[PDB]
Design a protein around this motif. Sequence first.
Motif, mmCIF file in Angstrom:
data_model
loop_
_atom_site.group_PDB
_atom_site.id
_atom_site.type_symbol
_atom_site.label_atom_id
_atom_site.label_comp_id
_atom_site.label_asym_id
_atom_site.label_seq_id
_atom_site.Cartn_x
_atom_site.Cartn_y
_atom_site.Cartn_z
ATOM 1 N N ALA A 9 0.812 -1.222 0.000
ATOM 2 C CA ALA A 9 0.000 0.000 0.000
ATOM 3 C C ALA A 9 0.845 1.272 0.000
ATOM 4 O O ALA A 9 0.311 2.395 0.047
ATOM 5 C CB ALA A 9 -0.948 0.005 1.185
ATOM 6 N N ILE A 10 2.166 1.111 -0.050
ATOM 7 C CA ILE A 10 3.054 2.266 0.002
ATOM 8 C C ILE A 10 3.476 2.599 -1.419
ATOM 9 O O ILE A 10 3.734 1.692 -2.239
ATOM 10 C CB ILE A 10 4.315 1.993 0.859
ATOM 11 N N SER A 11 3.512 3.887 -1.745
ATOM 12 C CA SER A 11 4.121 4.276 -3.011
ATOM 13 C C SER A 11 5.541 4.777 -2.794
ATOM 14 O O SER A 11 6.452 4.376 -3.517
ATOM 15 C CB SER A 11 3.279 5.315 -3.749
ATOM 16 N N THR A 12 5.742 5.630 -1.788
ATOM 17 C CA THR A 12 7.071 6.176 -1.555
ATOM 18 C C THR A 12 7.389 6.511 -0.098
ATOM 19 O O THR A 12 6.533 6.989 0.669
ATOM 20 C CB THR A 12 7.324 7.417 -2.444
ATOM 21 N N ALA A 34 0.580 -1.668 -14.161
ATOM 22 C CA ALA A 34 -0.205 -0.435 -14.184
ATOM 23 C C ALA A 34 -1.152 -0.403 -15.370
ATOM 24 O O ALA A 34 -1.896 0.573 -15.552
ATOM 25 C CB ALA A 34 0.729 0.798 -14.234
ATOM 26 N N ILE A 35 -1.135 -1.451 -16.187
ATOM 27 C CA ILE A 35 -1.876 -1.397 -17.457
ATOM 28 C C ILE A 35 -3.187 -2.152 -17.307
ATOM 29 O O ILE A 35 -3.221 -3.209 -16.672
ATOM 30 C CB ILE A 35 -1.094 -2.044 -18.631
ATOM 31 N N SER A 36 -4.279 -1.617 -17.846
ATOM 32 C CA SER A 36 -5.514 -2.418 -17.898
ATOM 33 C C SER A 36 -5.721 -3.098 -19.245
ATOM 34 O O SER A 36 -6.013 -4.287 -19.293
ATOM 35 C CB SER A 36 -6.758 -1.602 -17.509
ATOM 36 N N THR A 37 -5.564 -2.352 -20.337
ATOM 37 C CA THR A 37 -5.777 -2.911 -21.684
ATOM 38 C C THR A 37 -4.769 -2.405 -22.710
ATOM 39 O O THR A 37 -4.275 -1.279 -22.602
ATOM 40 C CB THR A 37 -7.181 -2.557 -22.224
ATOM 41 N N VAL A 38 -4.496 -3.232 -23.717
ATOM 42 C CA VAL A 38 -3.816 -2.794 -24.935
ATOM 43 C C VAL A 38 -4.816 -2.882 -26.100
ATOM 44 O O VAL A 38 -5.444 -3.923 -26.316
ATOM 45 C CB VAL A 38 -2.570 -3.640 -25.214
ATOM 46 N N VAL A 39 -4.994 -1.769 -26.812
ATOM 47 C CA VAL A 39 -6.012 -1.662 -27.850
ATOM 48 C C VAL A 39 -5.427 -1.165 -29.163
ATOM 49 O O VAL A 39 -5.116 0.011 -29.280
ATOM 50 C CB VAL A 39 -7.114 -0.662 -27.436
ATOM 51 N N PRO A 40 -5.294 -2.055 -30.164
ATOM 52 C CA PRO A 40 -4.749 -1.657 -31.471
ATOM 53 C C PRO A 40 -5.718 -0.752 -32.225
ATOM 54 O O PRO A 40 -6.937 -0.855 -32.029
ATOM 55 C CB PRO A 40 -4.587 -2.992 -32.216
ATOM 56 N N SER A 41 -5.181 0.126 -33.069
ATOM 57 C CA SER A 41 -5.992 1.029 -33.897
ATOM 58 C C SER A 41 -6.648 0.338 -35.097
ATOM 59 O O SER A 41 -7.478 0.934 -35.796
ATOM 60 C CB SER A 41 -5.110 2.152 -34.420
ATOM 61 N N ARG A 42 -6.233 -0.896 -35.364
ATOM 62 C CA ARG A 42 -6.780 -1.682 -36.460
ATOM 63 C C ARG A 42 -6.711 -3.143 -36.059
ATOM 64 O O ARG A 42 -5.859 -3.519 -35.242
ATOM 65 C CB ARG A 42 -5.968 -1.456 -37.745
ATOM 66 N N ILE A 72 8.974 10.022 -12.862
ATOM 67 C CA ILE A 72 8.284 8.778 -12.523
ATOM 68 C C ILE A 72 6.843 9.136 -12.168
ATOM 69 O O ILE A 72 6.604 9.987 -11.307
ATOM 70 C CB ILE A 72 8.996 8.036 -11.377
ATOM 71 N N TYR A 73 5.880 8.534 -12.866
ATOM 72 C CA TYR A 73 4.474 8.753 -12.549
ATOM 73 C C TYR A 73 3.969 7.585 -11.726
ATOM 74 O O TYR A 73 4.252 6.424 -12.048
ATOM 75 C CB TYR A 73 3.638 8.830 -13.818
ATOM 76 N N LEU A 74 3.194 7.886 -10.691
ATOM 77 C CA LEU A 74 2.723 6.873 -9.758
ATOM 78 C C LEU A 74 1.297 6.471 -10.122
ATOM 79 O O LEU A 74 0.644 7.168 -10.903
ATOM 80 C CB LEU A 74 2.806 7.415 -8.320
ATOM 81 N N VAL A 75 0.806 5.352 -9.594
ATOM 82 C CA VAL A 75 -0.517 4.878 -10.016
ATOM 83 C C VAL A 75 -1.590 5.892 -9.596
ATOM 84 O O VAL A 75 -2.661 5.969 -10.187
ATOM 85 C CB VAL A 75 -0.835 3.443 -9.529
ATOM 86 N N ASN A 76 -1.279 6.695 -8.592
ATOM 87 C CA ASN A 76 -2.202 7.732 -8.139
ATOM 88 C C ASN A 76 -2.006 9.064 -8.879
ATOM 89 O O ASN A 76 -2.710 10.046 -8.612
ATOM 90 C CB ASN A 76 -2.005 7.945 -6.662
ATOM 91 N N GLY A 77 -1.038 9.101 -9.794
ATOM 92 C CA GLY A 77 -0.872 10.244 -10.671
ATOM 93 C C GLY A 77 0.180 11.236 -10.199
ATOM 94 O O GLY A 77 0.588 12.123 -10.958
ATOM 95 N N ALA A 79 4.089 0.605 -7.244
ATOM 96 C CA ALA A 79 3.311 1.832 -7.210
ATOM 97 C C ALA A 79 3.550 2.671 -8.464
ATOM 98 O O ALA A 79 2.917 3.714 -8.654
ATOM 99 C CB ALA A 79 3.700 2.626 -5.966
ATOM 100 N N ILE A 80 4.474 2.237 -9.318
ATOM 101 C CA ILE A 80 4.826 3.044 -10.475
ATOM 102 C C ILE A 80 3.995 2.624 -11.670
ATOM 103 O O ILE A 80 3.761 1.438 -11.875
ATOM 104 C CB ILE A 80 6.323 2.929 -10.851
ATOM 105 N N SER A 81 3.537 3.598 -12.448
ATOM 106 C CA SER A 81 2.944 3.284 -13.746
ATOM 107 C C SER A 81 3.978 3.371 -14.858
ATOM 108 O O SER A 81 4.113 2.432 -15.649
ATOM 109 C CB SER A 81 1.763 4.206 -14.057
ATOM 110 N N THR A 82 4.688 4.494 -14.935
ATOM 111 C CA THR A 82 5.659 4.697 -16.022
ATOM 112 C C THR A 82 6.931 5.446 -15.615
ATOM 113 O O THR A 82 6.921 6.223 -14.660
ATOM 114 C CB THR A 82 5.042 5.474 -17.200
ATOM 115 N N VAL A 83 8.018 5.214 -16.359
ATOM 116 C CA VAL A 83 9.237 6.023 -16.242
ATOM 117 C C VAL A 83 9.482 6.728 -17.577
ATOM 118 O O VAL A 83 9.590 6.066 -18.613
ATOM 119 C CB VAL A 83 10.485 5.184 -15.842
ATOM 120 N N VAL A 84 9.553 8.067 -17.539
ATOM 121 C CA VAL A 84 9.613 8.930 -18.723
ATOM 122 C C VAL A 84 10.862 9.814 -18.677
ATOM 123 O O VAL A 84 10.870 10.824 -17.971
ATOM 124 C CB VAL A 84 8.385 9.889 -18.767
#
Lengths: 71, 65, 67, 67, 69, 67
Positions: free
Chosen positions: B53-56, D53-61, C21-26, C55-60
């Motif tokens: 439940a922890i993010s950071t 963190a992903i729910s779905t992958v949706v192709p454009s075609r 780094i974006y977290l699942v909570n944004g 807790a991470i969604s993406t690294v950009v």
Amino acid sequence: SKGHSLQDPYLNTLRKERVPVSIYLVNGIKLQGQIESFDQFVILLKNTVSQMVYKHAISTVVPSRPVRLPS
Amino acid sequence: SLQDPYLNTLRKERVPVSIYLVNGIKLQGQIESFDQFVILLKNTVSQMVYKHAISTVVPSRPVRL
Amino acid sequence: GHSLQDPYLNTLRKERVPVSIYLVNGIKLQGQIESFDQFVILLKNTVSQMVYKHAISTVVPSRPVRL
Amino acid sequence: SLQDPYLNTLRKERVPVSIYLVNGIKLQGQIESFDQFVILLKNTVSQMVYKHAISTVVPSRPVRLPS
Amino acid sequence: SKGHSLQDPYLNTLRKERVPVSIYLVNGIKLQGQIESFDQFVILLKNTVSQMVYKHAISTVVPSRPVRL
Amino acid sequence: GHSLQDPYLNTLRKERVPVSIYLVNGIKLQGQIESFDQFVILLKNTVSQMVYKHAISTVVPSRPVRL
Ligand SMILES: Nc1ncnc2c1ncn2[C@@H]1O[C@H](COP(=O)(O)OP(=O)(O)NP(=O)(O)O)[C@@H](O)[C@H]1O
Ligand SMILES: Nc1ncnc2c1ncn2[C@@H]1O[C@H](COP(=O)(O)OP(=O)(O)NP(=O)(O)O)[C@@H](O)[C@H]1O
Ligand SMILES: Nc1ncnc2c1ncn2[C@@H]1O[C@H](COP(=O)(O)OP(=O)(O)NP(=O)(O)O)[C@@H](O)[C@H]1O
Ligand SMILES: Nc1ncnc2c1ncn2[C@@H]1O[C@H](COP(=O)(O)OP(=O)(O)O)[C@@H](O)[C@H]1O
Ligand SMILES: Nc1ncnc2c1ncn2[C@@H]1O[C@H](COP(=O)(O)OP(=O)(O)O)[C@@H](O)[C@H]1O
Ligand SMILES: Nc1ncnc2c1ncn2[C@@H]1O[C@H](COP(=O)(O)OP(=O)(O)O)[C@@H](O)[C@H]1O
Ligand SMILES: Nc1ncnc2[nH]cnc12
């Protein structure tokens, strides 16, 4: 600082001494009651009925009073 | 390998930390202990926080490794 | 599962690339990857905070990166 | 045995995709690369998206589905 | 029941029978279609285009009509 | 381990106990437990549906289960 060397004694003390707790779920909902039992994945919390709370949905467990911590 | 010695240090030096939860809630205090799955955080009462439940974990002052 | 993840993170770490780094909570964290293991990433800025990967969604990265 | 070949098809054919995250965010681009835990999504830069963190992958075609 | 002893047969039945389903995600979003195939980790949901859904993001799978194992 | 979850769920099933299942997004489902495995629960009544356990927060029996 390894294994369940912390979580289990902790829950067990809460259970053994029938300490009233708050359990905060990951969605911010707060449950209150007493730990009746528990296993590797769930905690059984008492009140109107004994409900089964999944640990994966719990964020924190906050005892209504300080308690012995695990050694 | 990074997590343990890191949490260890925060515990040992008793550095006040902010723990942010996956829903955004911020918890504050000192880390009494931790195991593979939970962290015990200290204020009025010591509360048990599931790591899932922890993010950071943010120390309120810089530390080493 | 660390055959792309590890070299990717290590490259960001060695070259000190600024990243978000974006977290699942944004919540968006910014800084640089100081270090990482199987479960967490240590992100530097004011202090170095420990981020749980779950807790991470993406690294950009702020700029593109080789590999 | 299904996820892998599908993702590989999106990768090889460079199919534009939308990736929806578990929090509702919609990312767009193309699957550049992936391992057991992450997907490298290319566009402005190539970012690392954790599979959890992903729910779905949706192709454009419509695309070839794994047999 | 042990392991995947319910999930696989149930999904495999919805698949074989082409039963229209609604799939609710953990965020409350509803997808509709037919289960084309699945594996340990994802479900391919067929409609205009098939989409790959991570099981970890799904809360419920609700058939359009009663189904028998 | 499952020394509690499993006997609890099986008792609900065998005894046809009505339950309310609360999901992590706060939505409440109701019905009887028809079946379950290590990962999902099959809930039945006004609507029959398969529920992933990872998306459940609590299972609340409409009356107390006795081990
Ligand atoms: N790659 C991403 N991963 C997770 N969230 C993102 C991502 N990109 C954008 N977001 C979030 O979604 C919002 C809309 O993004 P957008 O307006 O398209 O700008 P962006 O260039 O994609 N990201 P940003 O530089 O932070 O504004 C952003 O403000 C972020 O909060
Ligand atoms: N071999 C795999 N193939 C496909 N997906 C996988 C595989 N292994 C793990 N995953 C996915 O990646 C996640 C597992 O990684 P994990 O280290 O457990 O972080 P996590 O707990 O899932 N993050 P979160 O769900 O947000 O708490 C799960 O969502 C899996 O569905
Ligand atoms: N395949 C999907 N997976 C996850 N979320 C989706 C998906 N499709 C739509 N959504 C969500 O549903 C909402 C918007 O979808 P909807 O109103 O049905 O049409 P739309 O997605 O906006 N059309 P478009 O975005 O142009 O393809 C957003 O919150 C999305 O996050
Ligand atoms: N120990 C905790 N664990 C998880 N969430 C908490 C905790 N303490 C407070 N919260 C949440 O923080 C939010 C802010 O409410 P808050 O003012 O803190 O209430 P209170 O002062 O009674 O604790 C609430 O949604 C509450 O659920
Ligand atoms: N069987 C179900 N499983 C999971 N979620 C559901 C189910 N039924 C309804 N919901 C959720 O309830 C939420 C409430 O949305 P709402 O606009 O009121 O429509 P509805 O009342 O049909 O659910 C929806 O976001 C949907 O995700
Ligand atoms: N036992 C529970 N487990 C998980 N969530 C619960 C539980 N009880 C109530 N909730 C949550 O609390 C919210 C509303 O609480 P509640 O007081 O029971 O609703 P109401 O005001 O309609 O009676 C719901 O969204 C539900 O998700
Ligand atoms: N989760 C978080 N929320 C706000 N500020 C932060 N600084 C570091 N982590 C943070």
